[PDB]
């Protein structure tokens, strides 16, 4: 459930894990 | 060409406001974002934080919280960082970098914006 | 959250001979699900912004010579240069790359000894 993330889910906007 | 090109160095009196530009080129510039990192003079590298370039969320690690802020114009592929109200501590050269295609290190950097806080 | 100690602080070689250099976590660094580590090695050679050299621990970078290798797993790491040039002169910085804040090392000095 990624609703505090929108937008396309980069790989580089996204770091660490995950 | 895949170049982070950073603005150039600034002199200011302590207490006033900083802004430092990072445009970027080569590269879709919304699917990586976008890291600032703090040298101080003569000493090591300190991570200051990190914006989001397609949600817009800027991340701030507990040592800059509160007078550092990162923005961005998306329109024309650039980063900027904001410092408010300069202390002598403040004097550094700071780098933007951008987070690799994997989400695990920091690709490519810009070349180092110096700025110096002084009377 | 994670304090990244890198020893040594300085450490002088002839040219050509073998360096090998520890960074070592106060956290693991091992994800379990992608089964990699997240740790990143850096070099600021003087007058330079960091350039990238191994990230996922021993994953070397595109154009990176054979003789900058990365290894080690969870909370200690190494890196290491097979044969020092005079070029290698540099500071080398290890950087977590596993969770906020993504810190960083106070970086080893490299210096050449003729």
């Known amino acids: 459930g990624a609703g505090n993330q929108p937008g396309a889910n980069g790989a580089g906007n996204q770091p660490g894990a995950n | 060409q895949i170049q982070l090109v950073q603005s150039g160095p600034e002199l200011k009196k302590p207490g006033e406001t900083v802004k430092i530009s990072c445009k970027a080129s080569g590269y879709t510039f919304t699917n990586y974002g976008m890291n600032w990192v703090k040298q101080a003079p003569g000493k090591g590298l300190k991570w200051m934080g990190w914006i989001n370039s397609n949600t817009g969320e800027p991340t701030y690690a507990e040592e800059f919280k509160g007078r550092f802020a990162f923005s961005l114009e998306t329109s024309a592929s650039t980063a900027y960082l904001q410092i408010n109200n300069l202390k002598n501590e403040d004097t550094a050269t700071y780098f933007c970098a951008r987070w690799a295609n994997c989400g695990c290190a920091m690709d490519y950097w810009g070349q180092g914006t110096t700025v110096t806080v002084s009377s | 959250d994670i304090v990244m100690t890198q020893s040594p602080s300085s450490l002088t070689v002839t040219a050509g001979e073998k360096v090998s250099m520890s960074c070592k976590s106060s956290?693991?660094?091992?994800?379990?699900?992608?089964?990699?580590?997240?740790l990143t090695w850096y070099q600021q050679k003087p007058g330079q912004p960091p350039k990238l050299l191994i990230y996922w621990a021993s994953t070397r970078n595109s154009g990176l010579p054979d003789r900058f290798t990365g290894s080690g797993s969870g909370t200690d790491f190494t890196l290491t240069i097979s044969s020092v040039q005079a070029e290698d002169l540099a500071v080398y910085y290890c950087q977590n790359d596993y969770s906020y804040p993504f810190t960083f090392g106070s970086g080893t000095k490299l210096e050449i000894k003729r």
């Open positions: 956290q693991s660094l091992f994800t379990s699900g992608k089964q990699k580590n997240y």
